[PDB]
Design an enzyme around this catalytic site. Structure first.
Site, short mmCIF file in Angstrom:
data_model
loop_
_atom_site.label_atom_id
_atom_site.label_comp_id
_atom_site.label_asym_id
_atom_site.label_seq_id
_atom_site.Cartn_x
_atom_site.Cartn_y
_atom_site.Cartn_z
N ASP A 1 -3.88 16.40 18.08
CA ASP A 1 -4.96 14.96 17.32
C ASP A 1 -4.44 13.72 17.39
OD1 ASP A 1 -6.02 14.93 14.55
OD2 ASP A 1 -4.27 15.40 13.25
N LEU B 1 6.11 8.39 0.12
CA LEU B 1 5.21 7.56 2.04
C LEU B 1 3.89 7.72 1.78
CD1 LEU B 1 8.21 7.61 4.09
CD2 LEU B 1 7.68 5.09 2.45
N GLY B 2 3.41 9.34 1.45
CA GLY B 2 1.88 9.97 1.34
C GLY B 2 2.19 11.06 1.45
N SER B 3 1.27 11.99 1.58
CA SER B 3 0.80 13.82 0.91
C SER B 3 0.23 14.44 1.92
CB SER B 3 0.46 13.77 -0.53
OG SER B 3 -1.33 12.62 -0.33
N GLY C 1 2.40 19.27 1.11
CA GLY C 1 3.62 18.37 -0.11
C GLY C 1 3.28 17.33 -0.18
N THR C 2 4.47 16.61 0.05
CA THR C 2 4.12 15.40 0.04
C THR C 2 5.63 14.17 1.25
OG1 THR C 2 6.70 15.07 -1.83
CG2 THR C 2 4.03 14.70 -2.44
#
Ligand SMILES: Nc1ncnc2c1ncn2[C@@H]1O[C@H](COP(=O)(O)OP(=O)(O)NP(=O)(O)O)[C@@H](O)[C@H]1O
Ligand SMILES: [Mg+2]
EC number: 2.7.10.2
Length: 268
Positions: free
Chosen positions: A127, A15-17, A21-22
């Site tokens: 954030d 789904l992302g990185s 990591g991932t």
């Protein structure tokens, strides 16, 4: 207390990185139901950062904050979260220009509800941006990414940063840049930027400007303009979030109430 690896099934696609990591989609076998999950898979500070993120999420329980299922350690160290199927708010609005202002109000109001709870819980997100709001449905938003978050001490209403790091300056209040002070009021400033992003359909704020140029702009009392088609009442709220002096800036209780009443006026 950890999750049992044997009860987790990972899908190979990501789904992302991140630097860690991932992010992968998966399934976790609960008491009876199988739950779809998003898993942050760590590939020494990187581990300390993810463990600190888990430590924050462990303490939060609210419908508008991404829930942490648990931590899992086997072939890799993993942070298991519930899955927000629709992804980041900025990317969703960029691809779905048909979304009505009433629907945007609903989603940003949900973010204000999660932030109201975070403020009561005495955590600073640090954030808060549209990229960090994840969508469960087109009508259900959750706050994610507690990577920079802090649990405020019982005796203080702010977190003091030692030095300037890799900061999302365009979302930061003047006292963050000037005094390195992070409070729920500084998250309110970020929420104003997030509102602008949402009513701008995921456009980036302060387009083409350097961080130092943004600080210089705000110091002259200048602010981003009203996004095309944004209700004036929502733009007025962004300007209130962008109150230079922290002491005069509203808290999330005032911001959520303003949003709640405006949304119900629109419903009416
Ligand atoms: N709970 C979740 N549910 C659904 N998707 C998620 C979840 N957590 C993370 N993702 C996805 O993974 C992506 C990257 O995760 P993120 O928390 O933003 O880490 P990062 O270190 O900031 N990496 P990046 O955004 O590329 O700079 C997000 O933009 C989402 O698309
Ligand atoms: Mg990210």
């Amino acid at each position: 207390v950890y999750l049992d690896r044997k009860l987790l099934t990972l899908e190979d696609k990501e789904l992302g990185s991140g630097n860690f990591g991932t992010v992968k989609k998966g399934y976790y076998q609960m008491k009876k139901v199988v739950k779809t999950v998003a898993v942050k898979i760590l590939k020494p500070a990187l581990k300390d950062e993810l463990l600190a993120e888990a430590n924050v999420m462990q303490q939060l329980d609210n419908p508008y904050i991404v829930r942490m299922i648990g931590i899992c350690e086997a072939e890799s160290w993993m942070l298991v979260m519930e899955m927000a199927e629709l992804g980041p708010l900025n990317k969703y609005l960029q691809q779905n220009r048909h979304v009505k202002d009433k629907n945007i109000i609903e989603l940003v109001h949900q973010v204000s509800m999660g932030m109201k709870y975070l403020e009561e819980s005495n955590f600073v997100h640090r954030d808060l941006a549209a990229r960090n709001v994840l969508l469960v449905t087109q009508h259900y938003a959750k706050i994610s990414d507690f990577g920079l978050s802090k649990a405020l001490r019982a005796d203080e209403n702010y977190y003091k940063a030692q030095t300037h790091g890799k900061w999302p300056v365009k979302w930061y209040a003047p006292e963050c840049i000037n005094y390195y002070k992070f409070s729920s009021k500084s998250d309110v400033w970020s929420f104003g930027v997030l509102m602008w992003e949402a009513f701008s359909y995921g456009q980036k704020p302060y387009r083409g400007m350097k961080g130092s140029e943004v600080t210089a702009m705000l110091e002259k009392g200048e602010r981003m303009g009203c996004p095309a088609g944004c209700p004036r009442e929502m733009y007025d709220l962004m300007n209130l979030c962008w109150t230079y002096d922290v002491e005069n800036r509203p808290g999330f209780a005032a911001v959520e109430l303003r949003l709640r009443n405006y949304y119900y006026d629109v419903v009416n």
